[PDB]
Design a protein around this nucleic acid. Sequence first.
DNA 1: TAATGACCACCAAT
DNA 2: ATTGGTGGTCATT
DNA 3: TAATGACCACCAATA
DNA 4: ATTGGTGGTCATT
Lengths: 75, 77
Amino acid sequence: SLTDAKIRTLKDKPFKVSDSHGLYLLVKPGGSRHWYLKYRISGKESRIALGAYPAISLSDARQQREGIRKMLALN
Amino acid sequence: SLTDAKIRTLKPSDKPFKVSDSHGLYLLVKPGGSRHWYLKYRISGKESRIALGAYPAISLSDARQQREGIRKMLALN
DNA sequence: TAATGACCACCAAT
DNA sequence: ATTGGTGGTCATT
DNA sequence: TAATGACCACCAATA
DNA sequence: ATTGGTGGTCATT
């Protein structure tokens, strides 16, 4: 999983930079760097935006994912 | 609003009390010594709460961010 | 004209 | 059977 | 257990 | 109309 060093040390086309547990940083050509969270609700796949980076830190994105997991843990 | 400085210096009480941050987030301080984060929310009119973790393991900013995650989920719909 | 939510595919490992 | 990683698309705000 | 999710009354503040 | 802030309870695990 990511450190904040690995993120600034990146570089194309849209690509996903994975942390863990479905959380990733989306990098688009322009410089658009936005956190997202892959999840399923009773089988269906979606994603939720956790804000823009570096405004939203990695540890910020992680804690957002944590709160969301607790919500999804029911049920 | 809540600050960590306020939490640090909370007076002991014989009774549970809630210390409000904002947007439904509070710290529940129980007589014993336990301090736990809870978020007050409603899903289509029905009220509940979710535990966000023990303070200080979970910090004020940590809990706030768990809340911002949860609020984004709730904002659907 | 972006960003977001809602998906697709295959696949490995729990 | 379900999630998470790699790598994408497309419609609705 | 002590902590959690659900959810009560009363009302003030958002919206 | 809906939430957020007081201040509580209750039954499971």
